[PDB]
From a paper:
Depletion of FzlA leads to cell filamentation, but leaves Z‐ring and divisome assembly unperturbed, suggesting that FzlA is required for active constriction.
To this end, we expressed an N‐terminal hexahistidine‐tagged version of C. crescentus fzlA in E. coli. Subsequent data processing, phasing, model building and refinement produced an electron density map at 2 Å and the corresponding model was of very good quality. It was possible to resolve residues 3–228 of FzlA and the asymmetric unit contained one molecule (Supporting Information Fig. S1 for stereo view of a portion of the structure). Satisfyingly, these residues map to the same face on FzlA's surface.
Author numbering: 3 to 228
Write the structure that this text describes.
């Protein structure tokens, strides 16, 4: 199968797909999309206008898989090597719960403040961050970090004994916040240790190489020691 991933580098959803494909050693070509500019041609691929979109081609027939709910389940169903969902129903349920936790709750309570006020406003030339919005995002982030810390002191990985899509979801989201220097790793020891381990995996390497014009990452962003 040929794979083309239409994505935006600093998008957590996109990064989850890049981590899953990398971890499964599935090659893909990438096409970067400035989706906020609503390029007509991308909206013809995905009517929501949002990345990521994975196009799988086999014998010149295309399967256009849009956004993470469809993409991640497709990957896990069709490429078992290695599994990013556990075998026990409880581990599968817990990982999926955590996918939803990050894609909805974390995205709303943290990203809607920290990523909106800094990255999105910059890209749309809408001016400076609202400092109160930033303070609200930072406090929400600390509450989410505390939650994952409590999990990681009781489990090896977020969803239990096996590394899963839940780890990649949390790490994808945190990696973008980390690019903008906003994660207080020093205060959450189990979470710091967990991220350091994820960040050193081969699948993470391209993500650490991400750079976008006008958006200069924190100095430690691509350091394996931080």
């Amino acid at each position: 199968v040929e794979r083309t991933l239409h994505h935006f580098p600093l998008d957590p959803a996109s990064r989850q797909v890049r981590l899953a494909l990398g971890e499964k050693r599935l090659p893909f070509v990438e096409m970067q999309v400035r989706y906020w500019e609503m390029p007509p041609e991308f909206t013809s691929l995905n009517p929501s206008g949002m990345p990521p979109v994975l196009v799988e081609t086999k014998h010149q027939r295309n399967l256009v898989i849009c956004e993470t709910r469809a993409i991640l389940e497709h990957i896990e169903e069709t490429e078992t090597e290695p599994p990013l969902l556990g075998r026990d129903p409880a581990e599968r349920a817990e990982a999926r719960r955590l996918l939803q936790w990050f894609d909805r709750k974390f995205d709303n309570e943290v990203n809607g403040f920290l990523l909106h006020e800094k990255m999105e406003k910059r890209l749309l030339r809408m001016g400076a961050p609202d400092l109160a919005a930033l303070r609200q995002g930072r406090e929400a982030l600390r509450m989410h970090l505390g939650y994952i810390e409590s999990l990681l002191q009781t489990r090896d990985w977020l969803a239990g004994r096996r590394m899963s899509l839940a780890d990649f979801a949390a790490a994808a989201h945190l990696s973008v916040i980390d690019y903008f220097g906003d994660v207080p790793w020093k205060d959450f020891q189990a979470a710091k240790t967990w991220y350091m381990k994820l960040k050193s995996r081969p699948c993470f390497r391209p993500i650490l190489a991400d750079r976008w014009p006008g958006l200069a990452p924190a100095a430690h962003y691509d350091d394996l020691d931080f």
